[PDB]
Write a protein that binds this ligand. Structure first.
Ligand SMILES: *[C@H]1O[C@H](CO)[C@@H](O[C@H]2O[C@H](CO)[C@@H](O[C@@H]3O[C@H](CO)[C@@H](O)[C@H](O[C@H]4OC(CO)[C@@H](O)[C@H](O)[C@@H]4O)[C@@H]3O)[C@H](O)[C@H]2NC(C)=O)[C@H](O)[C@H]1NC(C)=O
Ligand SMILES: CC(=O)N[C@@H]1[C@@H](O)[C@H](O)[C@@H](CO)O[C@@H]1O
Ligand SMILES: CC(=O)N[C@@H]1[C@@H](O)[C@H](O)[C@@H](CO)O[C@H]1O
Lengths: 390, 81
């Protein structure tokens, strides 16, 4: 319900900070994890790599896995008169075979002996699969950059940006804070492999295995879908007869394929695109970021802790509070010792502010170890909340 | 059946209702009588097969289910049912 909560709820969360000013800060992005960055007088940001997909990868080969036969035609000659022929034997949509069959007086020949026979049938593919080649480049990573403000929702999305190992340094705008500049590298994912697609379900398979599959196929850059290569793989020519020969096609191979792929890493996908779990290394600069809300008034009023203070998985706490006497204002937050003499701990939410009257403003802070006073607000009722961090 | 041609030669498109009956069609060289014995002769559809019925003069047929006695003819029929 609040901005920056997603990362707080994650178990895998890194805290990074720049040891310089205007310098680059390195971070490592992984699926299922997030990174929180902080810097003096800069807002705290959350980074997450949510998607890694290949867009329109080169199609290597289309394999037919189910076909039908039509217009089967037979031609044969008597012993002594050479090899017969059919013009459709020149039509790339047909599968044909040449053979020899006994001939004689019983079937129109002068001599008894072997004769040449030929049979062709139009081959029509009804269901095919295609294997694609994914290039490391042209891979597209989606990264969400969310401002760690604590603001609420239940319209405040983090900026989403898509990049490629070939795209240049990105300048992402964060409404209200400026822009953040970052560059990434697909720093170590392999692709002599191939990705097999059997009707919206894909697998990652080794090459030379895909290329060896005994099934009719077509070079990747095709669109006719008619001139199949090695159709005999799905066709069987029965023993011929003097003037006719039967030709039957094997049944679908979708099944033989499925129960043949068991074992190979299955690959998710959607909208025709393949998805992977990528790994990125990036560097970002915050010199163009600034705090949203500087130059306001220091709330002079009251807050009622909306509910039970929460402990995160990262040695930090999330305090919900809602104004009270004042403008949409800055909040006076400060974690001190039991004596209220020195400042201890620090805020992860920075320049925490109230946008509305009765608008739960979540605040994530890091209390020191042991005892400390969480002082929220000012002099009518400065809110002293005791806290013990174990 | 529909009588057409295939490279100058007569071609017979045989339908299901002709199974078991003598096929006769006039030709310059007199009347031609082809005999169709195809067991798999069915309904005319996409699954056709097409082949030749040889001329057979005073010779018993062997390893064939179609033949004519005056002029070699091509034949085509479906196998559907
Ligand atoms: C493989 O077999 C398929 C059948 O499953 C074929 O299809 C089409 O093939 C021919 C044309 O290529 C069609 O036949 C003709 O039909 C028209 C109209 O119905 C007639 O006007 C034609 O006429 C004839 O012309 C005459 C005078 O004008 C007549 O005296 C003469 O004897 C001719 O018969 C002719 O009948 C056929 O209907 C159609 N097939 C079907 C049934 O869907 C494929 O064409 C065939 N070829 C391949 C390998 O693809
Ligand atoms: C060459 C020859 O034998 N011609 C006859 C033909 O006249 C006759 O119509 C048919 C059956 O009646 O038998 C033969 O085809
Ligand atoms: C020579 C020729 O083809 N004419 C007749 C033919 O019309 C007839 O159908 C057949 C017997 O019925 O005898 C043939 O001689």
């Amino acid at each position: 319900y609040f901005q920056g909560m997603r990362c707080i709820g994650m178990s895998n969360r890194d805290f990074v900070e720049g040891v310089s000013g205007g310098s680059w800060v390195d971070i490592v992005l992984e699926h299922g994890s997030c990174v929180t960055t902080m810097a003096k007088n800069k807002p705290t940001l959350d980074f997450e790599l949510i998607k890694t997909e290949a867009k329109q990868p080169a199609t290597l080969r289309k394999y037919c896995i189910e076909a039908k036969l039509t217009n089967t035609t037979t031609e044969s000659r008597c012993p002594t008169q050479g090899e017969p022929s059919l013009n459709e034997e020149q039509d790339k949509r047909f599968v044909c075979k040449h053979s020899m069959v006994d001939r004689g007086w019983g079937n129109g020949c002068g001599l008894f002996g072997k004769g040449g026979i030929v049979t062709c049938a139009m081959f029509r593919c009804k269901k095919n699969m295609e294997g694609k080649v994914v290039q490391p480049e042209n891979l597209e990573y989606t990264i969400v950059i969310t401002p760690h403000s604590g603001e609420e929702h239940a319209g405040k999305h983090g900026k989403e940006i898509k990049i490629t190992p070939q795209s240049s340094i990105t300048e992402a705008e964060l409404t209200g804070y400026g822009t953040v500049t970052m560059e990434c590298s697909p720093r170590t994912l392999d692709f002599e492999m191939v990705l097999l697609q059997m009707e919206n379900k894909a697998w990652l398979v080794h090459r030379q295995w895909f290329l060896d599959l005994p099934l009719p196929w077509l070079p990747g850059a095709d669109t006719q879908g008619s001139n199949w290569i090695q159709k005999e793989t799905l066709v069987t020519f029965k023993n011929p007869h003097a003037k006719k020969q039967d030709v039957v096609v094997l049944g679908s191979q979708e099944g033989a394929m499925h129960t043949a792929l068991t074992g190979a890493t299955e690959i998710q996908m959607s909208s025709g695109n393949l998805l992977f779990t990528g790994h990125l290394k990036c560097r970002l600069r915050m010199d163009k970021l600034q705090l949203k809300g500087m130059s306001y008034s220091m709330c002079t009023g009251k807050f009622k802790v909306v509910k039970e203070i929460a402990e995160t998985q990262h040695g930090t706490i999330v305090i919900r509070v809602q104004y009270g006497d004042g403008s949409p204002c800055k909040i006076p937050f400060e974690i001190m010792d039991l004596e209220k003499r020195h400042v201890l701990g620090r805020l992860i939410t920075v320049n925490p502010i109230v946008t509305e009257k009765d608008s739960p403003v979540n605040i994530e802070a890091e209390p020191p170890f042991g005892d400390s006073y969480i002082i929220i607000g000012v002099e009518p009722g400065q809110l002293k909340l005791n806290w013990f961090k174990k | 059946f529909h009588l057409t041609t295939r490279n100058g030669e007569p071609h017979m498109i045989v339908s299901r209702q002709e199974k078991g009956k003598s096929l006769l069609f006039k030709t310059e060289d007199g009347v031609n009588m082809c005999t169709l014995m195809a067991m798999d002769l069915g309904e005319l559809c996409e699954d056709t097969i097409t082949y030749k019925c040889p001329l057979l003069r005073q010779n018993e047929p062997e390893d064939i289910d179609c033949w004519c006695n005056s002029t070699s003819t091509w034949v085509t029929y479906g196998t559907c049912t």
